Amino acid sequence: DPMLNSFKLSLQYILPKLWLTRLAGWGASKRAGWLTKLVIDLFVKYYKVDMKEAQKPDTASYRTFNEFFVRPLRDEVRPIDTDPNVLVMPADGVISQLGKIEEDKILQAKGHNYSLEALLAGNYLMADLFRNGTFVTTYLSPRDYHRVHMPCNGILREMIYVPGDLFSVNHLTAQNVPNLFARNERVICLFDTEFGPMAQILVGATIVGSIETVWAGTITPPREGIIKRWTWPAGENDGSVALLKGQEMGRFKLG
Amino acid sequence: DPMLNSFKLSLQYILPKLWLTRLAGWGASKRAGWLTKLVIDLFVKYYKVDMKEAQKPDTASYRTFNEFFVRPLRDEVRPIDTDPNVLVMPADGVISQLGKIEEDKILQAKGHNYSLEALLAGNYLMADLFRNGTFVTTYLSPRDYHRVHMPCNGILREMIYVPGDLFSVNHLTAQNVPNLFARNERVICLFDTEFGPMAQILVGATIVGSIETVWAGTITPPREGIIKRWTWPAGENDGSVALLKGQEMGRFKLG
Amino acid sequence: XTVINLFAPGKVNLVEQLESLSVTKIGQPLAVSTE
Amino acid sequence: XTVINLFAPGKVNLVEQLESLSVTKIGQPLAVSTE
Numbered sequence: 001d002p003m004l005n006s007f008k009l010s011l012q013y014i015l016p017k018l019w020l021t022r023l024a025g026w027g028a029s030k031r032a033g034w035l036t037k038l039v040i041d042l043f044v045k046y047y048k049v050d051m052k053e054a055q056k057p058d059t060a061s062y063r064t065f066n067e068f069f070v071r072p073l074r075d076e077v078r079p080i081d082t083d084p085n086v087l088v089m090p091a092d093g094v095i096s097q098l099g100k101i102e103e104d105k106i107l108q109a110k111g112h113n114y115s116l117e118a119l120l121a122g123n124y125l126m127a128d129l130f131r132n133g134t135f136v137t138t139y140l141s142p143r144d145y146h147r148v149h150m151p152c153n154g155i156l157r158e159m160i161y162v163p164g165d166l167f168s169v170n171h172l173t174a175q176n177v178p179n180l181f182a183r184n185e186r187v188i189c190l191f192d193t194e195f196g197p198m199a200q201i202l203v204g205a206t207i208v209g210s211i212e213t214v215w216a217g218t219i220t221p222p223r224e225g226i227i228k229r230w231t232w233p234a235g236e237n238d239g240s241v242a243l244l245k246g247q248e249m250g251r252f253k254l255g
Numbered sequence: 256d257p258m259l260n261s262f263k264l265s266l267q268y269i270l271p272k273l274w275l276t277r278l279a280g281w282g283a284s285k286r287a288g289w290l291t292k293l294v295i296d297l298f299v300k301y302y303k304v305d306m307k308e309a310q311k312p313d314t315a316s317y318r319t320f321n322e323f324f325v326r327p328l329r330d331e332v333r334p335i336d337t338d339p340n341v342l343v344m345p346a347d348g349v350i351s352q353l354g355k356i357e358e359d360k361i362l363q364a365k366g367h368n369y370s371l372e373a374l375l376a377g378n379y380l381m382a383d384l385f386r387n388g389t390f391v392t393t394y395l396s397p398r399d400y401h402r403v404h405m406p407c408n409g410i411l412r413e414m415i416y417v418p419g420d421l422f423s424v425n426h427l428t429a430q431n432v433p434n435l436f437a438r439n440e441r442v443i444c445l446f447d448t449e450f451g452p453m454a455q456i457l458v459g460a461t462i463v464g465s466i467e468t469v470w471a472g473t474i475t476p477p478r479e480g481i482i483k484r485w486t487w488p489a490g491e492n493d494g495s496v497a498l499l500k501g502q503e504m505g506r507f508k509l510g
Numbered sequence: 511x512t513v514i515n516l517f518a519p520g521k522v523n524l525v526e527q528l529e530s531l532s533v534t535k536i537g538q539p540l541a542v543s544t545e
Numbered sequence: 546x547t548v549i550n551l552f553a554p555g556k557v558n559l560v561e562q563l564e565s566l567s568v569t570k571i572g573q574p575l576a577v578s579t580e
Contacts, residue, residue: 016271078537086542087522091513095532098524101516114481119514122376122415122482130516134524134541138534140511148513149536160377163438164418165480169512181514183418183480195543196518203512225420225438226370227377246537252511335572342557342576344569346548352565356551374549389552389559389576393569403548404571424547436549450578451553458547501572507546 017166021209025255028065040068047143053077070251073145080246087152091138092145098136106135109175118182121162129197147251154191155235155242161228162186169205187211187219213250215241272421276464280510283320295323302398308332325506328400335501342406347399353391361390364430373437376417384452402506409446411496416483417441424460442466442474465508
């Protein structure tokens with residue numbers, strides 16, 4: 001078991017994670033006939049997907065695997081908490097870790113921390129806003145719905161794309177690969193909100209390596225290897241970009 | 256023959272550049288007696304390494320290949336320029352490009368630019384010190400001396416380690432790989448000097464991927480996959496780190 | 511996959527019921543203002 | 546490998562003789578301060 005797993009993790013270290021991702025995304029972009037339906041159906045059976053929650057519950061009505069993978073949910077099935085003083089969950093999934101940011105240190109697994117500055121690609125200014133703050137980390141399974149929504153009202157201020165690796169973020173590697181989320185390719189979004197500044201960070205993984213936001217479209221791929229920054233005004237301004245509590249902000253996808 | 260230079264580029268894309276780097280560094284750090292002397296000697300004639308400038312001209316004086324690679328030069332053969340108004344070259348080799356940072360863009364090759372902010376891992380504050388500044392890019396070939404020295408007196412202020420790829424830096428990849436130097440693994444050095452702020456950036460390559468500074472030792476390996484930032488006081492404060500024009504500040508090594 | 515949220519030091523209190531591996535459904539509550 | 550130097554905007558003039566493919570040797574002149 002402990003050595004079975006150290007083989008499972010050598011597999012993480014040995015199989016070419018980016019190549020497998022470009023292959024998956026290549027085929028998940030293709031409009032193949034019965035083939036994409038076949039792959040969807042097995043995926044659905046294997047992972048026990050719940051198509052009754054899908055807006056379009058028939059696997060035949062998805063033109064590609066990716067379209068299925070990013071399928072819209074039924075508006076009725078995810079009601080948004082209407083109190084203006086509570087913040088809603090941003091994504092379907094399960095909580096990995098959550099709590100207090102112990103002076104720049106965030107918990108990855110018990111016996112594994114990572115720094116706020118590492119997660120934030122070296123940006124001490126942005127790291128300053130959240131030192132001794134709170135964090136929540138959410139893991140979206142392949143079963144789950146793969147779009148992400150706003151936990152409260154927000155004015156978009158800053159977006160940063162960070163190049164990085166494509167380790168799996170199954171929770172085996174969460175307990176042995178140091179700096180998992182500070183190492184994997186990811187996209188950082190900073191909001192002004194009535195609860196202070198707020199960050200929502202979208203971390204890729206092997207296969208599920210493509211990340212988009214509603215204001216930008218697909219951010220990666222292509223994988224250009226460099227860090228990119230975009231900024232937006234303070235709100236109530238020309239060019240300002242805002243979203244309200246529970247609005248779709250981005251999504252995950254194969255490639 | 257654009258068949259053969261594209262053949263080489265194809266190899267840049269496919270061969271597992273990091274594993275070859277460790278493998279080469281594992282061998283380069285083995286004290287294997289007659290076998291390391293055999294490699295040094297083959298290396299010396301293939302690349303026409305001039306041993307007469309080395310403190311230790313006898314290839315038998317080197318216990319590992321790495322120790323040969325970082326071999327000290329004879330004190331007599333690199334006279335520093337005495338003029339305190341003149342900045343001197345930091346490294347042996349050939350100039351790749353130099354000139355005027357044209358509003359944050361640095362020239363890499365004909366028809367290839369890269370941004371100050373990409374070169375600096377997104378540090379836009381530090382990128383602001385050098386807009387419309389001046390840049391020099393020096394290639395150290397396998398033949399040259401592989402330590403690098405201060406171009407002038409300076410007080411260390413910041414050092415940034417940036418994870419990155421391990422592309423080969425040569426005059427073919429420079430003309431074809433976009434963002435070569437903002438993608439490859441590198442260590443950023445920021446100094447206070449009588450000429451203002453100055454950066455000396457050491458960027459690795461395939462096989463020659465190990466990077467050390469005189470004040471911290473070997474920075475890579477390990478390759479921990481995250482951005483680390485170190486800071487130092489301004490000068491005549493306890494802890495300040497100072498280095499004279501022509502002093503050794505770091506070096507490149509295999510693996 | 512993974513979304514990480516970050517909040518300012520004293521501006522937010524999060525549900526006492528929520529721990530690791532707690533199921534997460536988009537609309538439900540995650541934290542409440544300290545005001 | 547490769548060493549890259551950045552100098553601040555108006556603070557330094559490059560030796561007018563240097564160009565792409567000029568041999569460099571530690572301690573030879575590279576740039577001289579302005580004014």
